[PDB]
C-alpha cells in the first residue's frame, strides 16, 4: 500500500533536511495526514517531489485519480495533495514565516 509509512520512508531515503507530521482530526474536513518537509534548495524540493509522485504513480491505487504537483513555478514552496494526505515541501525561511505547525496543531490559538 501507499501510506504515511511510505511517505516517511521515501522522504528519509531522499534525505529531507527536516520532516514533520500532523494527525488531522476527522472533524476537520481536509485530510488525515499533514506532512511538512524542508529542503536544501528549490532543485532538491523539485527532485524529491517528483520522486514521491513517481512512487505514488507506480506503486498502487490505479483506481485512485492521479495527483497534481502545485508550486512548480515557485521555488520556495511546493505541495502535493494525495487522497488522504498532503505534503508541503518548502525552505527553512518559508516554513518559519508561514508557521504551518502552529496553524495545524493550534487551530484557533495562534496569530
Amino acid at each position: 500500500k501507499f501510506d504515511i509509512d511510505m511517505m516517511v520512508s521515501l522522504l528519509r531515503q531522499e534525505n529531507a533536511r527536516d520532516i514533520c507530521v500532523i494527525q488531522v482530526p476527522p472533524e476537520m474536513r481536509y485530510t488525515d495526514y499533514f506532512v511538512i518537509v524542508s529542503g536544501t534548495s528549490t532543485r532538491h524540493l523539485h527532485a524529491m517531489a517528483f520522486y514521491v509522485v513517481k512512487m505514488y504513480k507506480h506503486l498502487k491505487c490505479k483506481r485512485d485519480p492521479h495527483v497534481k504537483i502545485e508550486g512548480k513555478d515557485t521555488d520556495d514552496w511546493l505541495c502535493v495533495d494525495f487522497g488522504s494526505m498532503v505534503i508541503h515541501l518548502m525552505l527553512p525561511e518559508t516554513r518559519e514565516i508561514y508557521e504551518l505547525e502552529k496553524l495545524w496543531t493550534l487551530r484557533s490559538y495562534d496569530d
Binding site: 474536513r29 497534481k68 508550486g71 513555478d73 505541495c79 498532503v86 508541503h88 518559508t94 504551518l100
Partner: protein
C-alpha cells in the same frame, strides 16, 4: 460572480489587505475566458495603487446546492508564482476548493476554518 470593477474584501493576514486606503480593492481582470469569477478563479486586484493577483474564496452570487454563499465577495492575495501573500485566513473557506482544477493546497493550508 466577480467581474471587473467589483469591490472585493481581502480576507487575509497580508499587510496590503489589512492596510487602510481611500479606494477599496477592485477587480482589474478575471483570469477566465468569460470575465466571471467563481470560487477558485484568479483575478487581478488594485490594492493601494498596486496590481496584485488574488483568489476568490466566496461570493454573494448563489452557487450549486450544498455550497456556502457568503455575505461578501472574499478574496485571498497570491503572488505571481502562487504563494499566498498573507500567512493566515480567518473567515471560513469553502471545502469545494480542494477538488477544483488548479492549485489550492497552499490556500487550504493557510485557511483556519472550513465551511
Amino acid at each position: 460572480a466577480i467581474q471587473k470593477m467589483t469591490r472585493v474584501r481581502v480576507v487575509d493576514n497580508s499587510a496590503l489587505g489589512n492596510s487602510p486606503y481611500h479606494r477599496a480593492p477592485r477587480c482589474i481582470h478575471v483570469y477566465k475566458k468569460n470575465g466571471v469569477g467563481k470560487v477558485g478563479d484568479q483575478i487581478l486586484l488594485a490594492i493601494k495603487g498596486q496590481k496584485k493577483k488574488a483568489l476568490i474564496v466566496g461570493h454573494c452570487m448563489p452557487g450549486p446546492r450544498m455550497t456556502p454563499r457568503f455575505d461578501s465577495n472574499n478574496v485571498v492575495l497570491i503572488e505571481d508564482n502562487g504563494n499566498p501573500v498573507g500567512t493566515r485566513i480567518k473567515t471560513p473557506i469553502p471545502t469545494s476548493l480542494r477538488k477544483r482544477e488548479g492549485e489550492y493546497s497552499k490556500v487550504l493550508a493557510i485557511a483556519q476554518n472550513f465551511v
